[PDB]
Amino acid sequence: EDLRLHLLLNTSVTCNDGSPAGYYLKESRGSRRWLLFLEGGWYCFNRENCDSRYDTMRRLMSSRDWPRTRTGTGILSSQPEENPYWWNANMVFIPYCSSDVWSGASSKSEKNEYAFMGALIIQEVVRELLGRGLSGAKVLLLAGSSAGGTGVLLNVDRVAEQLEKLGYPAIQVRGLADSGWFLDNKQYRAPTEAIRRGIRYWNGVVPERCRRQFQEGEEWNCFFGYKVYPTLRSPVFVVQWLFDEAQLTVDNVHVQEGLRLYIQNLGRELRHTLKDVPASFAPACLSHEIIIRSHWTDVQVKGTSLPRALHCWDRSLHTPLKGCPVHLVDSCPWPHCNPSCPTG
Numbered sequence: 001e002d003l004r005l006h007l008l009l010n011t012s013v014t015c016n017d018g019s020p021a022g023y024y025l026k027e028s029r030g031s032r033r034w035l036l037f038l039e040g041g042w043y044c045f046n047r048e049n050c051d052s053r054y055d056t057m058r059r060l061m062s063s064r065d066w067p068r069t070r071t072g073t074g075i076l077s078s079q080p081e082e083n084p085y086w087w088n089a090n091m092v093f094i095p096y097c098s099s100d101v102w103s104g105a106s107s108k109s110e111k112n113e114y115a116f117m118g119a120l121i122i123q124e125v126v127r128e129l130l131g132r133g134l135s136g137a138k139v140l141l142l143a144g145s146s147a148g149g150t151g152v153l154l155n156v157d158r159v160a161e162q163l164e165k166l167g168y169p170a171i172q173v174r175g176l177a178d179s180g181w182f183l184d185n186k187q188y189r190a191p192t193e194a195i196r197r198g199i200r201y202w203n204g205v206v207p208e209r210c211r212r213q214f215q216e217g218e219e220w221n222c223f224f225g226y227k228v229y230p231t232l233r234s235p236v237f238v239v240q241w242l243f244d245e246a247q248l249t250v251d252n253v254h255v256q257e258g259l260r261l262y263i264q265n266l267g268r269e270l271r272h273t274l275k276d277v278p279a280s281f282a283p284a285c286l287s288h289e290i291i292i293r294s295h296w297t298d299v300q301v302k303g304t305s306l307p308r309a310l311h312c313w314d315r316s317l318h319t320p321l322k323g324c325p326v327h328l329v330d331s332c333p334w335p336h337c338n339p340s341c342p343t344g
Ligand SMILES: CSc1cccc(Sc2ccc3n[nH]c(=O)n3n2)c1
Pocket: 040, 041, 042, 043, 101, 145, 146, 147, 148, 150, 180, 182, 190, 191, 192, 194, 195, 223, 224, 246, 247, 250
């Protein structure tokens, strides 16, 4: 139970119910690398569905019941055997308690039953960590899974701008977006409408260059990785299963020719969106999330594991590297055509 809870000293930066947000921290005194991980867990987009979430998913809307510690797993593990990539880094787990895909900038008030402060939570965590050693960092990797992976895409450049404006231009900010790269595709039998409604409910904010492209009322576009990624300046590594279970869920998929063609076309479209993403890991598996699973080391694409690919990415950010690839996208067209896919 190696990561210790700190509730935010600025108690106006809150979870949905107005309780303070926070972060779990395990410092590594001999390290200038910082990993800030954004938890996922869907979202809620109106009073009624947020009230439902508060009844049965309250840890995602409140800190009142959070434990004092959490165990770092996968990329958050400090054990080299579990985390070949960054086992010696300073580790931060930021709980998702804003239900806004990390985009919100709205306080609880006379007119708002809930606070949606995901974007401000990240910025407040960063600011408070600067007093705890982040000021000496050489690399800040903002990582996240599921809604947290989309959160990376929405927030990585804002973290880079925050540190520049605070006078730390030497800290290299990078993103690792796991399982947050979705397609606004046709369903097999309204995802984009729920986000459009959510953005208004949350006062959601998107990266500036993406906002300027799509403009007022169209900011929902920036929640889709293939549209927001080209607008970003920070290096971002994209991890995405080609047949992501959450993508299939929103597509109303739960095998005859129509569905076979649908699934194959989904994998093809996902692969196509990653063709010009130089740092990516996209196995042909039906699964969801990878980076904080203890067995995250097991999956390989073209014989290369994700921890290896991430290490190769670090080297590339010091022309391609002999035997140390960073772009790893499966080409086989059906779930589990890659033998290293997770079993479940
Ligand atoms: C509904 S269109 C969309 C597009 C981009 C991000 C999101 S948010 C989301 C989507 C799927 C998922 N699975 N697990 C988890 O946390 N999430 N979060 C939604």
